[PDB]
Amino acid sequence: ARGPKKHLKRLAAPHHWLLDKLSGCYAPRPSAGPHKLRESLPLIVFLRNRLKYALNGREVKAILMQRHVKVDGKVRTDTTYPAGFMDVITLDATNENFRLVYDVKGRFAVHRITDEEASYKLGKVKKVQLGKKGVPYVVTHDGRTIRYPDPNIKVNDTVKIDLASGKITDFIKFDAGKLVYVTGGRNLGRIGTIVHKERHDGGFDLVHIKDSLDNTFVTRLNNVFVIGEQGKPYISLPKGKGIKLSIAEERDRRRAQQGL
Amino acid sequence: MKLNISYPVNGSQKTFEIDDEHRIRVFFDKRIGQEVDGEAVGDEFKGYVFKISGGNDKQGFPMKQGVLLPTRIKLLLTKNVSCYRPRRDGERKRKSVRGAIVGPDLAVLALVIVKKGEQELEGLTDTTVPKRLGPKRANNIRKFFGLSKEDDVRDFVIRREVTKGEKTYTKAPKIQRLVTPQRLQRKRHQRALKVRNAQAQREAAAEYAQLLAKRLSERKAEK
Amino acid sequence: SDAVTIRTRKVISNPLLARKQFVVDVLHPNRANVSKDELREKLAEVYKAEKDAVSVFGFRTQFGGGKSVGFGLVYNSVAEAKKFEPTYRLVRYGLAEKVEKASRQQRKQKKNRDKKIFGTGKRLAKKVARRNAD
RNA sequence: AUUCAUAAUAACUUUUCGAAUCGCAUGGCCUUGUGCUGGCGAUGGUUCAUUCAAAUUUCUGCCCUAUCAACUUUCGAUGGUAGGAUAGUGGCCUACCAUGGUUUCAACGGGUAACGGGGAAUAAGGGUUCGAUUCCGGAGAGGGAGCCUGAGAAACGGCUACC
RNA sequence: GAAACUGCGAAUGGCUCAUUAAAUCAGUUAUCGUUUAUUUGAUAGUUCCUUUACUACAUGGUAUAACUGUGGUAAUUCUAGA
Known about the structure:
This is part of a larger assembly, with chains A, B and C. By secondary structure, chain A is mainly β. In chain A, a hairpin with a 6-residue loop joins strand 2 (88-90) and strand 3. Helix content of chain A is 9%, strand content 16%. Chain A is globular, with a radius of gyration of 20 Å. In chain A, the strands form five sheets. In chain A, strands 1-2-3-4 form a four-stranded antiparallel sheet, with no helix packed on it. In chain A, strands 5-9-10 form a three-stranded antiparallel sheet, with no helix packed on it. Chain B has three helices and seven strands; from the N terminus they run E-E-E-E-E-E-E-H-H-H. Chain B has helices at residues 139-142, 184-196, 198-218; strands spanning 3-6, 13-16, 36-37, 49-57, 72-76, 94-98, 106-113. In chain B, the strands form two sheets. In chain B, strands 2-1-7-4-3 form a five-stranded mixed sheet, with no helix packed on it. A two-stranded antiparallel ribbon of chain B has the order 5-6. The longest helix of chain B has 21 residues, at 198-218. Chain B starts with a strand and ends in a 5-residue tail after the last helix. Chains in contact: A-B, A-C. Chain B binds two RNA strands through strand 1, strand 2, strand 4, strand 6 and strand 7. Chain A: One of its GO terms (molecular function) is rRNA binding. Chain A: Residues 41-104 form the S4 RNA-binding domain. Chain A: It is found in: Cytoplasm.
């Protein structure tokens, strides 16, 4: 009706933000999306939901204006800038360099990295074709389109990029035997590494997915996202390690790992 | 009828009183700015070619030229008419004005001068008026003094002076269009960009032609 | 006066804001609901900031007396204590002062009549002075 | 899955497009002079993608009444063709041609103290009655109607007309 | 920096349920049947037909606001000539 609604309110939120309801208000609306949909992450929720440094909204407003917190080399000097997939976050002095990955339950992390490996992304390439002035163009996860790629990467791969120029460095294939880090669904991000895929043509396509826990489950193709070959992993792998070990034993191991 | 006398040569204005109830019958059935001989009015005025430039009335209605009706009319006025100064961005709007033929509906007539007369240069050119705001543009200087342009502007900058704070504020219009780098240093970098920029992706199709010549030779060596 | 034991829990330095974040534990038998401004003196003896360089709020006492919990925030300098701090608390601890504002009637009653004028308000003021009263 | 993306032809255009703008630092080099380089912001414009969107859009599901059995079509009903118009397919409107389309698996008409749903109250199982209203989505800003600006209004803390 | 032009906002919010029984709406598809303000990402050396009196690009033209001083009507965010 008549124009784009810029006010959303809490108790309509993408629940993986994990915002309570006694503050319970107009939610922090993201900006216009750089990368993908409203499964993103604004800045001023992250600084005082799990990172827990910000106290007032004017105080986190008094952070990003002075070119303090940096993303992808840039700063993104407006407030509610969204966050893509495996986004790097360059920090200031004391050097707490971060990275978003998602846990065994869809929630994020409290994750910190070093400056090593903190110079490249992995982008879900999805639309590679040739445009005007004869150039083959490629797209990324963030839409950071890059000129003159290596021809025949394929569709639906991931690439190792530059984030200072365009310049993808090392692509990867997508066949039977990889390692896959899926996102989207009830069971996003364990690892599945392959067991099978099929045609299913036109409606969707499916990827059969099995971690070291050796149960196998099936997920539609748009959610799967490789980050390597068998036993590769590219990134600093988090401490929940991507298993989603079951309901009883996590209570049983917290009955054990607290050391009674 | 009232005699608002104004003057397009450098400037003068004050509104005067009326008697000539029969010589205002010279005035009508032309809208604005055509002709009123001063001798057609009583001869307190001579050497004066009166052109008329509107006025007001009971109800305070101004005059717009889209008339040919000797009373008021309410009308759709949008952009370039006397009203709507602007407001809420269209806003067509509707108000009411009179235009043409002058009657005793009127209250004031804005009389404005074509020819200078001989007798009454005390309400036209008594004193030359101090027009306030000078030239703001550097283009508005060199033919303002006819400099036949080489005379290197910033010569005659008007400093206006009152030393009531002991330091007299020494101010002057701060002309734009001042031709020095950084007009040209900005201009040079845009001249320097597509030197350094357009060649850089021109030296990207070059490397595209190199390693893909061998790559399109490799599956051309398919046997 | 009965081993007030001002202790802390969850100390975290935030050096991009150059501050220490903490809570204010207190066990105060037979002296209940201690203070605000006296505690900013004693909290200095972990960083030696000043007498007034530490921001703090809270001190809800718990049922029965004897104990309270607050949330305090200490920075380096007073010159830093004008930059990233609660300005109402900067009014509070004697740092800032009263800042005057129109009560929200006579702010919105100030700017509505000034919205329905057009100039800067002396052209028509001459005309009312010229006519009515003429 | 394409006449797709793209490239080149042979041409057209009241030409659309490609800087006459501002802030800090004040550089480098000698051919010492507006010689020449000369960084970073703050804007803004052609295309192509991402988001925000917005538009349509197929499948199923909608209380009560046959003391409502036929309903529609020259005042478009149902199709085809051709054109217009849209931001965009299409009876969305027009010219011509054809006579169809729904229906006792309840069409059509009438009632609703009928905004729909997630949801409430009740509690062996199966239910019954609500849900105007803390969220989602639709509609309205006395009643209708038309409107210029703007990316986006049939806006109503915008406008014109009639009651 | 008081205004005032220029740019974006005013189409989101907030209220109410009047109309509205394959209509909205819930799920479910689709756009190879479409338009996008911004956020992000990349992207124009060729503009001269006088394509050699381009005539200035080491940088053009007017058309005007607040303001000055003159007004009306009783009033209205009423406006005029200079």
